[PDB]
Swiss-Prot record:
This is Flavodoxin. PROSITE patterns: FLAVODOXIN (PS00201), FLAVODOXIN_LIKE (PS50902). Its cofactor is FMN. Residues 3-144 form the Flavodoxin-like domain. Gene3D superfamilies: 3.40.50.360. It comes from the Bacteria. Transmembrane segments: none annotated. Belongs to the flavodoxin family.
Length: 147
């Protein structure tokens, strides 16, 4: 199976998360394509992928709390080929904030509205993902199993 991992990361937490997930998948036998949201084009992004994992950090704001690099993707999610696609979301945040990993909720909700198949509840990481290594690995483990 082929998996696409797209992440929006500002300080590198979600990026570390994405790489950890990517390794787990790889070791399981998937061909994984991991990409920074800043370098992708939305049109047909998901074509040909068996699994798509989208991740992004959350930023407190009155309009849009998504990580800046992920915004363009999010705004054109309807052109990615999400209908009937098996997907799962992840993101880093901080429980000291009102909307803890609110970006995860937003992405899941929009994917659900576009007809994607959410395979598992999103991975919401509080603080340093290097300290949540087990959680990431375990979650990656569960999404493979839901596929
Ligand atoms: C100014 C600021 C605002 C933040 N706002 C939120 C927030 O609304 N919700 C959340 O869960 N985390 C929030 N966080 C924490 C970031 O989402 C958290 O640091 C995350 O690890 C960053 O991930 P990244 O390196 O992949 O971008 C904020 C952090 C900063 C510095």
């Amino acid at each position: 199976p082929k998996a696409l991992i797209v992440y929006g990361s500002t300080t590198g937490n979600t990026e570390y998360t994405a790489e950890t997930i990517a390794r787990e998948l790889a070791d399981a036998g998937y061909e994984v394509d991991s990409r920074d949201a800043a370098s992708v084009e939305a049109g047909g992004l998901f074509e040909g992928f068996d699994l798509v994992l989208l991740g992004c950090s959350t930023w407190n704001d009155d309009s849009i709390e998504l990580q800046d690099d992920f915004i363009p993707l999010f705004d054109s999610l309807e052109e990615t080929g999400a209908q009937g696609r098996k997907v799962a979301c992840f993101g880093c945040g901080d429980s000291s904030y009102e909307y803890f990993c609110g970006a995860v909720d937003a992405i899941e909700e929009k994917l659900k509205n576009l007809g994607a198949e959410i395979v598992q509840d999103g991975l919401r990481i509080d603080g340093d993902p290097r300290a949540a290594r087990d959680d990431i690995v375990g979650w990656a483990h569960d999404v493979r199993g839901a596929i």
